[PDB]
Amino acid sequence: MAKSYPTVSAEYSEAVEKARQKLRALIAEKSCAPLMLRLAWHSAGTFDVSSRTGGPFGTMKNPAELAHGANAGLDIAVRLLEPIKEEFPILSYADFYQLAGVVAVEVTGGPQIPFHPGREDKPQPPPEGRLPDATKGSDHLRQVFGKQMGLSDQDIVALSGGHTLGRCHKERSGFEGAWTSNPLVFDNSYFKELLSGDKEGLLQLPSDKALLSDPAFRPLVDKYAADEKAFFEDYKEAHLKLSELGFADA
Ligand code: HEM
Numbered sequence: 001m002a003k004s005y006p007t008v009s010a011e012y013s014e015a016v017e018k019a020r021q022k023l024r025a026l027i028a029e030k031s032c033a034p035l036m037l038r039l040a041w042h043s044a045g046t047f048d049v050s051s052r053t054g055g056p057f058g059t060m061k062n063p064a065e066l067a068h069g070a071n072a073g074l075d076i077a078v079r080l081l082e083p084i085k086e087e088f089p090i091l092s093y094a095d096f097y098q099l100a101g102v103v104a105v106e107v108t109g110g111p112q113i114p115f116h117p118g119r120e121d122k123p124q125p126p127p128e129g130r131l132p133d134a135t136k137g138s139d140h141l142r143q144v145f146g147k148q149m150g151l152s153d154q155d156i157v158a159l160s161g162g163h164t165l166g167r168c169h170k171e172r173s174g175f176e177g178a179w180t181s182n183p184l185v186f187d188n189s190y191f192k193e194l195l196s197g198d199k200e201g202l203l204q205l206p207s208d209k210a211l212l213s214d215p216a217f218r219p220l221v222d223k224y225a226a227d228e229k230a231f232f233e234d235y236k237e238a239h240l241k242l243s244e245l246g247f248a249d250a
């Protein structure tokens, strides 16, 4: 009941469904689901509840936001998706990029995340510096996900499981390597690799390791490593919340 979703036209809803189908095909065919999940997350994760600035309002299309250091490489994702966007002028970029994130999780075998249309494209990007710093720890994660975005500790641990997709690139973040042996498969392997310690061929960031030493985060890592269904349930809830920060609040 925390949300009151806007009414959109039948034509808007039809465009969402047709765009979903085109996104499913493109993301699968080009093997770019991890990049598209990162696009949606960096679009949404800039929300700050105290000022109600940032969040999933289409501003990743803005070259000034693409130039943020944390967003290196997301210009590739924006350009890959633009041919589909041009077929759906009625849709906001805000909705379109969050739909891409939902589809990315779907096509890699993850949960079905609900999607509610109607986000506005806002003119001003957030200030640079809202997103989490991979070199920091649990206090920082709580400041960013908790105090800025308004999400819970469970949400932090479940959303970190998104690193079951993809990898770090030396020219983008500067880190290099994949978290899992199956970077195009959405499963609970991220938590299993965390628990087993470091191993050759795989990467862990300091922010990942912070989940192991924190007394509230660690039981959730244990849970998700043992129970993929529980991970999918909590991930679905957290991604839905993330994708709607600042949107349709009652
Ligand atoms: C918890 C704090 C987080 C930190 C510190 C963090 C940091 C990073 C870094 C440094 C990269 C590498 C970028 C590159 O070099 O290409 C990355 C990639 C990625 N992030 Fe995270 N991230 C966090 C949370 C999340 C969340 C919440 C999600 C989505 C639910 C997510 C999804 C991804 C994905 C899928 C990739 C791989 C992208 C690709 O393969 O192109 N991350 N993240």
Ligand SMILES: O=C1O[C@@H]2[C@@H](O)CO[C@]2(O)C1(O)O
Pocket: 031, 032, 033, 034, 035, 036, 166, 167
């Ligand atoms: O998801 C992704 O799409 C890119 C594609 O080139 C293959 O791997 C990538 O570099 C990626 O991980 O960013």
Ligand code: NA
Pocket: 163, 164, 165, 180, 181, 182, 183, 184, 185, 186, 187, 189
């Ligand atoms: Na994986």
